Enzyme design. Structure first.
Site, PDB file in Angstrom:
ATOM      1  N   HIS A 212      -9.094  22.948  76.690  1.00  0.00           N
ATOM      2  CA  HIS A 212     -10.484  23.021  77.129  1.00  0.00           C
ATOM      3  C   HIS A 212     -11.120  21.660  76.897  1.00  0.00           C
ATOM      4  O   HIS A 212     -11.193  21.195  75.750  1.00  0.00           O
ATOM      5  CB  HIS A 212     -11.268  24.110  76.378  1.00  0.00           C
ATOM      6  CG  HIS A 212     -10.922  25.523  76.763  1.00  0.00           C
ATOM      7  ND1 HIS A 212     -11.246  26.614  75.966  1.00  0.00           N
ATOM      8  CD2 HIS A 212     -10.335  26.032  77.868  1.00  0.00           C
ATOM      9  CE1 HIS A 212     -10.842  27.722  76.556  1.00  0.00           C
ATOM     10  NE2 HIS A 212     -10.285  27.397  77.709  1.00  0.00           N
TER      11      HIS A 212
ATOM     12  N   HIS B  38     -10.682  27.295  63.307  1.00  0.00           N
ATOM     13  CA  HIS B  38     -10.267  28.201  64.372  1.00  0.00           C
ATOM     14  C   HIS B  38      -9.507  27.492  65.480  1.00  0.00           C
ATOM     15  O   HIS B  38      -8.909  28.164  66.327  1.00  0.00           O
ATOM     16  CB  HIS B  38     -11.472  28.944  64.972  1.00  0.00           C
ATOM     17  CG  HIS B  38     -12.533  28.045  65.519  1.00  0.00           C
ATOM     18  ND1 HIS B  38     -13.601  27.611  64.762  1.00  0.00           N
ATOM     19  CD2 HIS B  38     -12.698  27.507  66.752  1.00  0.00           C
ATOM     20  CE1 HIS B  38     -14.374  26.838  65.504  1.00  0.00           C
ATOM     21  NE2 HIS B  38     -13.850  26.760  66.716  1.00  0.00           N
TER      22      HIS B  38
ATOM     23  N   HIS C  15     -10.229  20.756  72.952  1.00  0.00           N
ATOM     24  CA  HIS C  15      -9.565  21.571  71.949  1.00  0.00           C
ATOM     25  C   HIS C  15      -8.630  22.493  72.707  1.00  0.00           C
ATOM     26  O   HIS C  15      -8.656  22.550  73.933  1.00  0.00           O
ATOM     27  CB  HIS C  15     -10.571  22.357  71.097  1.00  0.00           C
ATOM     28  CG  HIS C  15     -11.395  23.305  71.911  1.00  0.00           C
ATOM     29  ND1 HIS C  15     -12.500  22.900  72.621  1.00  0.00           N
ATOM     30  CD2 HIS C  15     -11.226  24.620  72.194  1.00  0.00           C
ATOM     31  CE1 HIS C  15     -12.994  23.928  73.292  1.00  0.00           C
ATOM     32  NE2 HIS C  15     -12.240  24.984  73.050  1.00  0.00           N
TER      33      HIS C  15
ATOM     34  N   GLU D 114      -6.682  31.661  77.382  1.00  0.00           N
ATOM     35  CA  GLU D 114      -7.852  32.520  77.414  1.00  0.00           C
ATOM     36  C   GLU D 114      -8.049  33.100  78.805  1.00  0.00           C
ATOM     37  O   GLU D 114      -8.177  34.315  78.969  1.00  0.00           O
ATOM     38  CB  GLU D 114      -9.077  31.716  76.979  1.00  0.00           C
ATOM     39  CG  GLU D 114      -8.972  31.251  75.546  1.00  0.00           C
ATOM     40  CD  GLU D 114     -10.309  31.217  74.866  1.00  0.00           C
ATOM     41  OE1 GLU D 114     -11.099  30.300  75.179  1.00  0.00           O
ATOM     42  OE2 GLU D 114     -10.577  32.100  74.027  1.00  0.00           O
TER      43      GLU D 114
ATOM     44  N   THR E  71     -16.192  30.776  74.871  1.00  0.00           N
ATOM     45  CA  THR E  71     -15.283  31.843  74.501  1.00  0.00           C
ATOM     46  C   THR E  71     -15.235  32.074  73.001  1.00  0.00           C
ATOM     47  O   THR E  71     -14.511  32.957  72.544  1.00  0.00           O
ATOM     48  CB  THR E  71     -13.870  31.562  75.046  1.00  0.00           C
ATOM     49  OG1 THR E  71     -13.297  30.412  74.405  1.00  0.00           O
ATOM     50  CG2 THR E  71     -13.941  31.336  76.543  1.00  0.00           C
ATOM     51  N   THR E  72     -15.976  31.303  72.229  1.00  0.00           N
ATOM     52  CA  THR E  72     -16.129  31.575  70.814  1.00  0.00           C
ATOM     53  C   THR E  72     -17.608  31.732  70.513  1.00  0.00           C
ATOM     54  O   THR E  72     -18.461  31.235  71.265  1.00  0.00           O
ATOM     55  CB  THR E  72     -15.537  30.444  69.956  1.00  0.00           C
ATOM     56  OG1 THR E  72     -16.053  29.195  70.414  1.00  0.00           O
ATOM     57  CG2 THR E  72     -14.043  30.423  70.082  1.00  0.00           C
TER      58      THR E  72
ATOM     59  N   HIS F 183      -6.367  26.378  72.800  1.00  0.00           N
ATOM     60  CA  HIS F 183      -6.133  27.743  72.370  1.00  0.00           C
ATOM     61  C   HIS F 183      -4.656  28.038  72.607  1.00  0.00           C
ATOM     62  O   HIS F 183      -4.108  27.636  73.629  1.00  0.00           O
ATOM     63  CB  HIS F 183      -7.008  28.730  73.166  1.00  0.00           C
ATOM     64  CG  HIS F 183      -8.478  28.498  73.025  1.00  0.00           C
ATOM     65  ND1 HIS F 183      -9.246  29.142  72.075  1.00  0.00           N
ATOM     66  CD2 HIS F 183      -9.325  27.693  73.714  1.00  0.00           C
ATOM     67  CE1 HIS F 183     -10.504  28.756  72.197  1.00  0.00           C
ATOM     68  NE2 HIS F 183     -10.580  27.886  73.190  1.00  0.00           N
TER      69      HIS F 183
HETATM   70  N1  LIG Z   1     -13.695  27.756  73.918  1.00  0.00           N
HETATM   71  S1  LIG Z   1     -14.964  26.997  74.775  1.00  0.00           S
HETATM   72  O1  LIG Z   1     -15.723  28.075  75.722  1.00  0.00           O
HETATM   73  O2  LIG Z   1     -14.449  25.743  75.714  1.00  0.00           O
HETATM   74  C1  LIG Z   1     -16.182  26.293  73.664  1.00  0.00           C
HETATM   75  C2  LIG Z   1     -16.760  25.072  73.994  1.00  0.00           C
HETATM   76  C3  LIG Z   1     -17.709  24.508  73.152  1.00  0.00           C
HETATM   77  C4  LIG Z   1     -18.075  25.194  72.020  1.00  0.00           C
HETATM   78  O3  LIG Z   1     -19.048  24.632  71.197  1.00  0.00           O
HETATM   79  C5  LIG Z   1     -17.487  26.423  71.700  1.00  0.00           C
HETATM   80  N2  LIG Z   1     -17.889  27.163  70.515  1.00  0.00           N
HETATM   81  C6  LIG Z   1     -18.016  26.528  69.224  1.00  0.00           C
HETATM   82  O4  LIG Z   1     -17.768  25.372  69.130  1.00  0.00           O
HETATM   83  N3  LIG Z   1     -18.439  27.337  68.086  1.00  0.00           N
HETATM   84  C7  LIG Z   1     -18.607  26.819  66.731  1.00  0.00           C
HETATM   85  C8  LIG Z   1     -19.668  27.676  66.014  1.00  0.00           C
HETATM   86  C9  LIG Z   1     -19.335  28.933  65.500  1.00  0.00           C
HETATM   87  C10 LIG Z   1     -20.309  29.694  64.864  1.00  0.00           C
HETATM   88  N4  LIG Z   1     -21.540  29.247  64.748  1.00  0.00           N
HETATM   89  C11 LIG Z   1     -21.887  28.062  65.228  1.00  0.00           C
HETATM   90  C12 LIG Z   1     -20.978  27.230  65.875  1.00  0.00           C
HETATM   91  C13 LIG Z   1     -16.544  26.982  72.535  1.00  0.00           C
HETATM   92 ZN   LIG Z   2     -12.045  26.716  74.162  1.00  0.00          ZN
END
Ligand SMILES: NS(=O)(=O)c1ccc(O)c(NC(=O)NCc2ccncc2)c1
Ligand SMILES: [Zn+2]
EC number: 4.2.1.1
Length: 257
Positions: free
Chosen positions: A116, A61, A91, A103, A195-196, A93
């Site tokens: 991010h 993703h 990472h 986002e 956000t994921t 977006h």
């Molecule tokens: N965009 S963010 O708010 O900076 C952000 C920062 C750190 C994070 O870990 C995530 N989210 C994930 O990494 N999800 C992977 C996952 C998906 C389904 N099941 C288990 C794990 C988003």
């Molecule tokens: Zn992010």
């Protein structure tokens, strides 16, 4: 299972992650006229001088660069944070087009991308305990717009060909995260979520006022990545961003008058 298409995209995530309709979800639109300047905020202190990058990975993703977080090597403190937050990964977006991709939005304006940088509160011992805590994570968000090339991004850009499909990783040592920071560290802050999925409500968002500029060739190489793994239908990785969620009972504070 969840993704960013018509059938598994952000409008379906509540079916598996009911917190997607919670009270402090992210991202939000930053209404710059309703944000309050808070003088009780401290300057952001970014101490990335001894950061140790390990790998870059396509996770299907997004793509992600990971860091050695077993020691205080790259930390964030100050700002609205209390304690010391270690850098764990960053990472991006981005969109299919330069008028969408971020986002967070600022006065409803979308940027072409968002960086991010994910940090976690050391008092909780590891990142998996921190994500269950109301203040376990701090994410530094940086907008990208399309203009001149950004030199500190080019090392990332050059390796993307090595991680084109989901699950590929490459060695990525000796990367300097400071090369991705804008000149000013003015910021907005608010309590939010990831956000994921799983969209845990554990994040203190710190969003920088000043965007970094990247060249069109640099962003073109982001869009050449694939959501799919090798040996599958080819789905280009674009529009991997969640739309803005309601602020509800939250105030955004600004660090700058
Ligand atoms: N965009 S963010 O708010 O900076 C952000 C920062 C750190 C994070 O870990 C995530 N989210 C994930 O990494 N999800 C992977 C996952 C998906 C389904 N099941 C288990 C794990 C988003
Ligand atoms: Zn992010």
């Amino acid at each position: 299972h969840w993704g960013y298409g018509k059938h598994n995209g952000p409008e379906h995530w509540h079916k598996d992650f009911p917190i997607a309709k919670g009270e402090r979800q992210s991202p939000v639109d930053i209404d710059t006229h309703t944000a309050k300047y808070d003088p009780s905020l401290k300057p952001l202190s970014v101490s990335y001088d001894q950061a140790t990058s390990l790998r870059i990975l396509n996770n299907g993703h997004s793509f992600q660069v990971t860091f050695d977080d077993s020691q205080d090597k790259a930390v964030l403190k100050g700002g609205p944070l209390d304690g010391t937050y270690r850098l764990l990964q960053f990472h991006f977006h981005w969109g299919s087009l330069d008028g969408q991709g971020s986002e967070h939005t600022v006065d409803k304006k979308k940027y072409a991308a968002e960086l991010h940088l994910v940090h976690w509160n050391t008092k909780y011992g590891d990142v998996g305990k921190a994500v269950q805590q109301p203040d376990g994570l701090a994410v530094l968000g940086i907008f990208l717009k399309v203009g001149s090339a950004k030199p500190g991004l080019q090392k990332v850009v050059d390796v993307l060909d090595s991680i084109k499909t989901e699950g590929k990783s490459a060695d990525f040592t000796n990367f300097d995260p400071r090369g991705l920071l804008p000149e000013s560290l003015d910021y907005w802050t608010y309590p939010g979520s990831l956000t994921t999925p799983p969209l845990a409500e554990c994040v203190t968002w710190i969003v920088l006022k000043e965007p970094i500029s990247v060249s069109s060739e640099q962003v073109l190489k982001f869009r050449k990545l694939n959501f799919n793994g090798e040996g599958e239908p080819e789905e280009l990785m674009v529009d991997n961003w969640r739309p803005a969620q309601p602020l509800k009972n939250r105030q955004i504070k600004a660090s700058f008058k």
